[PDB]
């Protein structure tokens, strides 16, 4: 009566543990991959991250400059 009224079967806890373990393992792998990607992006600067500003080329004036050699 106690097991029928207050508790479920073992398969519920078993498969819930399966789901929890899968989610946590995926999160751990994602954390490690994110750390590695951050390291590579900061070292090389060839990704969307760690892009530091440079001078805009639209500020350059491409006109004759009163002297032929600029």
């Amino acid at each position: 009566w106690i097991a029928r009224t207050f508790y479920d079967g073992p398969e519920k806890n078993y498969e819930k543990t399966m789901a929890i373990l899968q989610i946590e393992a995926e999160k751990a792998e994602l954390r490690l991959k994110e750390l590695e990607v951050r390291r590579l992006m900061r070292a090389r600067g060839d990704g969307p991250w760690y892009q530091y500003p440079t001078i805009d080329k639209a500020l350059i004036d491409h006109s004759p400059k009163t002297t032929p050699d600029n």
Binding site: I2, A3, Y7, P10
Partner: protein, 104 residues
């Protein structure tokens, strides 16, 4: 003033038995005190204690002890009948284990 400040004198402790000879030591209000005693005794001894002990005593076997005993009896019966050793020193089949190629 030969004193350092103005303070109340330290009051004497009140005795609950002075106003209520049967006081139960819960409150100075006799009705509130009596009902405090009643609720503590009912919900501590009658509800939590006895019913909780009864609930814990009849907790269903999720630790799987009787199941393990029956499984052990089955295994012992089969191994004794077939002449196999009761327990093996290896819990994993060596066919699935690949030891390193070289030990030198």
């Amino acid at each position: 003033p030969t004193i350092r400040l103005q303070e109340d004198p330290d009051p004497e402790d009140e005795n609950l038995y002075e106003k209520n000879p049967d006081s139960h030591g819960y409150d100075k209000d006799p009705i509130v005190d009596l009902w405090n005693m009643r609720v503590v005794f009912f919900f501590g001894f009658s509800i939590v204690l006895v019913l909780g002990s009864t609930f814990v005593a009849y907790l269903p076997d999720y630790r799987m002890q009787e199941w393990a005993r029956r499984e052990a009896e089955r295994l012992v019966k089969y191994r004794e009948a077939n002449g196999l050793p009761l327990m093996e020193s290896n819990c994993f089949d060596p066919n699935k284990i690949q030891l390193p190629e070289d030990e030198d």
